[PDB]
Amino acid sequence: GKCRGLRTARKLRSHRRDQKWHDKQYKKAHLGTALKANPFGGASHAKGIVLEKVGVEAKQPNSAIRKCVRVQLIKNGKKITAFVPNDGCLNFIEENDEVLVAGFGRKGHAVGDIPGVRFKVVKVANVSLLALYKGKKERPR
Amino acid sequence: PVARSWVCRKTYVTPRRPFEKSRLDQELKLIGEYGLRNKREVWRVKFTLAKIRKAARELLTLDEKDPRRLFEGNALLRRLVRIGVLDEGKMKLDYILGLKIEDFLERRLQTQVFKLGLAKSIHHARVLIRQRHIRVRKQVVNIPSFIVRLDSQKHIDFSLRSPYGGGRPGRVKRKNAKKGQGGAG
Amino acid sequence: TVTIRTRKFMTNRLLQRKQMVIDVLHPGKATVPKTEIREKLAKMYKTTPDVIFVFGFRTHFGGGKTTGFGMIYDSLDYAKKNEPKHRLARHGLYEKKKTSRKQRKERKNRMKKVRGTAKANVGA
Amino acid sequence: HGSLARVGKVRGQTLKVAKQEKKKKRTGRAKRRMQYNRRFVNVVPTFGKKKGPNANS
RNA sequence: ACGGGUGACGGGGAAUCAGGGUUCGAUUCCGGAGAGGGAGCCUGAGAAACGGCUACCACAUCCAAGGAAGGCAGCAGGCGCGCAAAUUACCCACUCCCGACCCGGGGAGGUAGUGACGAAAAAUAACAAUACAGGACUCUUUCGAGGCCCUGUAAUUGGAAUGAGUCCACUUUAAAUCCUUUAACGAGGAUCCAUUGGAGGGCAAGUCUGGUGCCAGCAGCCGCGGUAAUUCCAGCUCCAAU
Numbered sequence: 064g065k066c067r068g069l070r071t072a073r074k075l076r077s078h079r080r081d082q083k084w085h086d087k088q089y090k091k092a093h094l095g096t097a098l099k100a101n102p103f104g105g106a107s108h109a110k111g112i113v114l115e116k117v118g119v120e121a122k123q124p125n126s127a128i129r130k131c132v133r134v135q136l137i138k139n140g141k142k143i144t145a146f147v148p149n150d151g152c153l154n155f156i157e158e159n160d161e162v163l164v165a166g167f168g169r170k171g172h173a174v175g176d177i178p179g180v181r182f183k184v185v186k187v188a189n190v191s192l193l194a195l196y197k198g199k200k201e202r203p204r
Numbered sequence: 205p206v207a208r209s210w211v212c213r214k215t216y217v218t219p220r221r222p223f224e225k226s227r228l229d230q231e232l233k234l235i236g237e238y239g240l241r242n243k244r245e246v247w248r249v250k251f252t253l254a255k256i257r258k259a260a261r262e263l264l265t266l267d268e269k270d271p272r273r274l275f276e277g278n279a280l281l282r283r284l285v286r287i288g289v290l291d292e293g294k295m296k297l298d299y300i301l302g303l304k305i306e307d308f309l310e311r312r313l314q315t316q317v318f319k320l321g322l323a324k325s326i327h328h329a330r331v332l333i334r335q336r337h338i339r340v341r342k343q344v345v346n347i348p349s350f351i352v353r354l355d356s357q358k359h360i361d362f363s364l365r366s367p368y369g370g371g372r373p374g375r376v377k378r379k380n381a382k383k384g385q386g387g388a389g
Numbered sequence: 390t391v392t393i394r395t396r397k398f399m400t401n402r403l404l405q406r407k408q409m410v411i412d413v414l415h416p417g418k419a420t421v422p423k424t425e426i427r428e429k430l431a432k433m434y435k436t437t438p439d440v441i442f443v444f445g446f447r448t449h450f451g452g453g454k455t456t457g458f459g460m461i462y463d464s465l466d467y468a469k470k471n472e473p474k475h476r477l478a479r480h481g482l483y484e485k486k487k488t489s490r491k492q493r494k495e496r497k498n499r500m501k502k503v504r505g506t507a508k509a510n511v512g513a
Numbered sequence: 514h515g516s517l518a519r520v521g522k523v524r525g526q527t528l529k530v531a532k533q534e535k536k537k538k539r540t541g542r543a544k545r546r547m548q549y550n551r552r553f554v555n556v557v558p559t560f561g562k563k564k565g566p567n568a569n570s
Numbered sequence: 571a572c573g574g575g576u577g578a579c580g581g582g583g584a585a586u587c588a589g590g591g592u593u594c595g596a597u598u599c600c601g602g603a604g605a606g607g608g609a610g611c612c613u614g615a616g617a618a619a620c621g622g623c624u625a626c627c628a629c630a631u632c633c634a635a636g637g638a639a640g641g642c643a644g645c646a647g648g649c650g651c652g653c654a655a656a657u658u659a660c661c662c663a664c665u666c667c668c669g670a671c672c673c674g675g676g677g678a679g680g681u682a683g684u685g686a687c688g689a690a691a692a693a694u695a696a697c698a699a700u701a702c703a704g705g706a707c708u709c710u711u712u713c714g715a716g717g718c719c720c721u722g723u724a725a726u727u728g729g730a731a732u733g734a735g736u737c738c739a740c741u742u743u744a745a746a747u748c749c750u751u752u753a754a755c756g757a758g759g760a761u762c763c764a765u766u767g768g769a770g771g772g773c774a775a776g777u778c779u780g781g782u783g784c785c786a787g788c789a790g791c792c793g794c795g796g797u798a799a800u801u802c803c804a805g806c807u808c809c810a811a812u
């Protein structure tokens with residue numbers, strides 16, 4: 064604070080309120096357009112339909128073909144790309160199937176090797192991909 | 205509108221640093237020296253001690269001769285003496301801040317059963333309390349974290365309905381004694 | 390081995406009662422039936438054991454003691470008059486009907502649709 | 514390029530080692546007691562630094 | 571100011587917190603508002619009432635096609651919606667409410683069923699004797715012994731225990747259930763089998779082994795994978811919470 068006087072509470076409050084909007088973590092949270100462009104809309108998870116099983120090339124130095132999924136969400140109709148995490152788990156996901164998709168952890172930010180993907184798959188056809196990976200539950204058919 | 209209470213309170217806290225060796229090395233020491241079941245039973249006592257130290261700090265900022273300080277500090281010192289973590293020779297508000305977790309962990313019924321010669325080890329003491337062997341003033345108790353008062357420590361005894369006290373022998377002994385003499389007749 | 394003590398004894402000239410807390414000392418035994426508690430209280434207070442209504446028994450952990458409530462009456466007519474129906478039915482001197490709440494409400498809402506003396510002709 | 518037909522290659526072609534049957538692990542206060550006895554009772558100090566719990570050199 | 575927006579019912583309060591603060595408050599208490607959306611009224615002390623009426627709008631039920639009957643943001647329940655939420659149960663015994671009333675009614679309320687939202691307590695072993703490895707001790711230059719004396723773990727032997735569970739009875743209770751009391755059974759690999767995540771750093775914890783070979787995949791960030799991977803996939807072991 065630079066003005067200090069006894070009647071400067073209005074100036075301090077109005078200046079602090081106006082300088083909140085230059086904060087990135089405040090402006091994203093308190094303007095609506097971030098939530099509108101958010102494919103989840105404030106939701107932690109979303110159910111979608113698998114449109115395609117796609118292969119996204121990784122970035123620089125780390126060279127791999129990440130196995131992602133082109134999903135169309137149900138609450139919005141909006142098409143995203145989610146990441147099928149572990150080894151061999153794209154076999155347990157079929158085209159035209161309903162998955163549960165969460166974020167990956169950096170709150171709408173591309174993570175690690177992968178261009179642009181900010182979503183991952185936790186369940187497929189109401190059985191979790193972790194259980195299908197560990198062999199606890201089989202894929203119903 | 206239902207006639208329920210909903211008043212609950214978490215009785216412990218997790219430490220801010222999850223993997224500090226200088227903390228883990230001293231919690232495992234207390235667990236081993238007092239036969240505790242996990243780290244949460246260390247943290248519950250640390251939690252309780254933090255409340256006693258905090259309330260003593262808020263009483264110590266106020267000046268003397270003010271009846272809130274006099275009344276609440278007197279009540280806190282009386283219950284600390286009544287538990288037995290603070291001796292009667294140091295009934296002053298500044299000596300509360302000298303308390304440690306081991307003084308409270310030595311007032312557990314698991315510790316007192318092991319100290320009073322009723323048990324061999326501190327884990328012997330816990331399984332004896334859990335197996336309904338020990339009563340405190342005619343009340344059979346199976347909580348090892350039962351905080352034993354100074355006056356109530358004199359009446360820690362084995363329960364009447366226990367083979368270690370004056371009771372009927374248990375199921376393994378009576379199964380052997382019936383199986384052998386039922387084969388013998 | 391079974392001993393009974395009374396606590397907070399208080400006569401009641403309002404419902405014609407004597408109300409007390411029953412302390413049932415039964416070490417080594419299962420908790421004592423209410424009829425036995427009535428007759429052991431009856432010998433204690435010199436009263437016939439058909440006017441004594443005991444209830445609310447909880448036995449403490451460890452099992453050397455049990456606390457309940459008891460209410461003894463000046464006469465059996467007053468014991469019939471100002472007593473709960475469920476305690477009278479536990480004594481057996483009262484029988485309530487078997488009738489449900491669901492079907493009784495449905496019969497009430499079925500006699501709501503008719504007027505005059507057809508309300509008795511709705512049933513059966 | 515960008516072949517998606519090579520999913521799970523390493524998990525599929527790795528050699529299956531069956532898990533070996535081993536002894537039961539004691540739990541709770543027993544596990545805390547043996548972890549107290551393994552670190553504060555029987556072990557003796559080492560020249561220079563100490564030794565790691567899983568060091569197999 | 572006015573206007574617009576509000577993932578705004580408000581408050582008692584909730585979370586986090588050194589001191590300030592920041593965030594939440596649909597939600598059991600108080601006050602407001604509304605009963606599909608608006609509108610209008612009767613009766614009554616009190617209503618612009620909706621488990622009252624009257625329209626119109628939208629939706630929807632029966633029909634001899636003339637007509638009639640609506641209103642679960644009550645309790646259950648169903649569809650739909652979604653990441654996301656329980657039984658078409660029992661009772662007026664409690665709390666209190668209403669009535670002409672000591673007597674009747676109350677999905678208000680209470681009681682159970684589902685219930686890892688979440689909170690409190692707390693099992694998954696404990697102990698002897700044999701080994702065996704230690705320290706401590708008399709002695710010994712050491713190499714060593716012995717046991718006065720302990721501690722540790724050994725798929726070594728061994729009796730003593732106890733709870734989960736099965737189950738009489740009693741209590742509990744409107745009637746029950748459950749807890750508690752207590753008979754009878756009920757443990758040794760006490761198989762009556764504790765998981766979830768990790769093990770390069772951050773960050774506690776293998777440079778063990780095998781396969782793979784910038785592929786598969788790991789990786790919150792830095793980074794690992796290029797034929798000798800502390801980082802993948804598995805085995806063994808260890809660590810953290812339980």
Ligand SMILES: [Mg+2]
Nearest residue numbers: 122174175176
């Ligand atoms: Mg990067």
Ligand SMILES: [Mg+2]
Nearest residue numbers: 576577578579
């Ligand atoms: Mg709103």
Ligand SMILES: [Mg+2]
Nearest residue numbers: 580595596597
């Ligand atoms: Mg509110």
Ligand SMILES: [Mg+2]
Nearest residue numbers: 577578579596
């Ligand atoms: Mg809302």
Ligand SMILES: [Mg+2]
Nearest residue numbers: 604605617619
């Ligand atoms: Mg209204």
Ligand SMILES: [Mg+2]
Nearest residue numbers: 606641642643
């Ligand atoms: Mg509606």
Ligand SMILES: [Mg+2]
Nearest residue numbers: 605618619620
């Ligand atoms: Mg209206």
Ligand SMILES: [Mg+2]
Nearest residue numbers: 621641642644
């Ligand atoms: Mg209605």
Ligand SMILES: [Mg+2]
Nearest residue numbers: 605619620621
């Ligand atoms: Mg109404």
Ligand SMILES: [Mg+2]
Nearest residue numbers: 653654655687
């Ligand atoms: Mg839910």
Ligand SMILES: [Mg+2]
Nearest residue numbers: 662663664665
């Ligand atoms: Mg009632």
Ligand SMILES: [Mg+2]
Nearest residue numbers: 205645677679
């Ligand atoms: Mg209700």
Ligand SMILES: [Mg+2]
Nearest residue numbers: 540694763764
């Ligand atoms: Mg188990």
Ligand SMILES: [Mg+2]
Nearest residue numbers: 769801803804
């Ligand atoms: Mg590994």
Ligand SMILES: [Mg+2]
Nearest residue numbers: 770771772773
């Ligand atoms: Mg690390």
Ligand SMILES: [Mg+2]
Nearest residue numbers: 565773774775
């Ligand atoms: Mg380390």
